[PDB]
């Protein structure tokens with residue numbers, strides 16, 4: 001909140017990259033899979049190119065730019081690497097290709113093959129992304145299994161900074177305005193007061209971990225979002241997933257304490273899951289247990 005942010009924003013020529021397929025699309029614009037072939041560097045970087053939507057509202061561009069702002073000011077193995085923007089009519093965000101898609105889909109699609117080892121490693125890896133975000137005094141405000149992408153089954157990275165807010169000169173909490181937020185992932189203090197802290201991010205972590213352990217269930221599957229604040233005030237939380245020893249579950253529960261300072265610090269989460277990741281089967285009981293291409297992580 002006083003350190004100058006000297007991250008470099010890279011402006012890309014539209015002709016430095018070719019689109020190949022079309023990955024997702026819809027409510028935002030279109031995401032393409034493609035390659036970024038800088039200058040005459042002899043490298044090709046698999047990328048994901050997200051473009052505005054077309055029909056350019058001064059509303060849309062102001063946001064993809066905020067995101068670009070945020071994404072350019074982070075550099076961590078567990079946070080998504082933003083390559084640059086391309087300033088065409090329609091602004092494109094260019095980021096690292098996460099070939100295995102997002103983690104939420106990946107656990108669903110692969111239930112019968114996910115071992116305790118992967119699950120705990122993911123948990124540790126996310127804990128690391130977030131603890132780094134906490135260092136950068138950054139509040140994600142939208143942590144969920146949908147917003148973690150899979151670069152390889154053993155390497156996940158946090159994504160989606162369309163809510164992330166950077167904490168100004170020593171603020172503690174962010175006092176957000178109105179507007180849509182995913183209710184089933186939010187700390188209670190967030191629902192009732194729109195306060196967001198690093199600790200409200202812990203809460204969402206707790207739910208993310210619960211999405212992982214139930215191989216992609218939907219939290220409060222039945223309950224509609226309107227009831228939630230009450231239900232949680234009742235002192236009720238999510239069920240202990242089947243595969244989960246009490247050790248693991250106890251940690252989820254801690255992330256869900258009302259007294260935000262009572263919940264654990266990402267640095268502690270790292271320690272705890274990493275102790276557990278040394279003996280995965282003690283904590284999760286799972287039945288069965290082209291030529292010039294370079295990954296963005298090696299292009300510096």
Ligand SMILES: CN[C@@H]1C[C@H]2O[C@@](C)([C@@H]1OC)n1c3ccccc3c3c4c(c5c6c(n2c5c31)CCCC6)C(=O)N=C4
Pocket residue numbers: 023024025028031048050095096097098099100101102149
């Ligand atoms: C719903 N499910 C979709 C699968 C997909 O389209 C979507 C639109 C969806 O999820 C949000 N989507 C995005 C939507 C908004 C921002 C970024 C993405 C996105 C990215 C990537 C995606 C990939 C695949 N989608 C990728 C991406 C499909 C599998 C290969 C990689 C990627 O590598 N970096 C970013």
